[PDB]
Design a protein around this ligand. Structure first.
Ligand SMILES: CC(=O)N[C@@H](CCC(=O)O)C(=O)O
Ligand SMILES: CC(=O)N[C@@H](CCC(=O)O)C(=O)O
Lengths: 157, 146
């Protein structure tokens, strides 16, 4: 459980349990990155698959269990960490061991250019963009789309 | 100011070929116009932007979106695309990674799917059954640019 992975200049914490992360520090990173509130009891009610957090908690990728394919629940990068390559670092380390992935994004999310560039697939809905990597089977994709549709939002306000 | 053509014989072909080759900076494979079943083409009067829809399965297939760099600056490509969309509610098309129009395609599409090294885009399809048919047509369709 838990260790550090280098990506170029940067060092990244890989954790498979919330117990191995500084949760108050991680919540502050997420809420500061999105300028929104995480729903109450987020860590307690979210089944972690793997989290990747930069050593100094300036960027994070959180994968969770939502059906058969790993679900990217949060990609948080501090605005103040911009240009340092930190977001790309945590994303890259995650992708190296996560060949299949899906996630969702609001239409106005500042990360969307990055998501278009990185994703293999995309499905547009009225209020969400659904993205995936590594999925070819159309039922798997359909199930991922349904999971995004049915999953309550965990960023509010 | 936009030509709408349902047969190749109503277009200036070496001219259209020159537009296509300038836009893509690649060569249009020999015998393109005679082995490509036209559905309809929208071509700017001075052949600086074109949208070519062809017959490839049940859904209209956008085979070529060719716009000169300066025409793209002027928004002419977007204008021709808009004219096409007003009478073409359903369509699919494909692109490679370096395609200058990808940002536009990401914005215009209702989705995309990667097969081989193509991204296959669609508009106006929402059922995965329809989407699956379109992707299948792109797979065994050879490139027309070299
Ligand atoms: C990738 C990522 O951060 N997904 C978050 C939030 C996206 C958003 O608010 O637009 C999600 O669960 O969809
Ligand atoms: C939409 C469109 O013009 N497709 C072109 C170009 C594809 C590419 O090489 O990127 C085609 O020949 O299918």
């Amino acid at each position: 459980s838990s260790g550090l992975v280098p990506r170029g200049s940067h060092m990244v914490i890989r954790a498979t349990t919330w117990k191995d992360l500084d949760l108050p520090r991680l919540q502050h990173l997420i809420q500061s990155s999105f300028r929104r509130t995480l729903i109450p009891h987020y860590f307690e009610t979210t089944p972690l698959l793997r989290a990747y957090v930069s050593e100094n908690y300036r960027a994070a990728v959180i994968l969770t269990k939502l059906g058969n394919v790993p679900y990217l629940d949060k990609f948080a990068v501090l605005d103040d960490a911009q240009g340092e390559g930190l977001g790309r670092a945590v994303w890259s380390i995650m992708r190296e061991e996560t060949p299949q992935l899906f996630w969702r994004s609001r239409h106005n999310n500042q990360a969307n250019a990055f998501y278009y560039a990185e994703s293999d697939g995309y499905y547009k809905q009225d209020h969400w963009k659904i993205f995936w990597n590594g999925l070819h089977h159309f039922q798997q994709i359909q199930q991922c789309v349904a999971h995004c549709t049915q999953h309550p939002p965990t960023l509010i306000d």
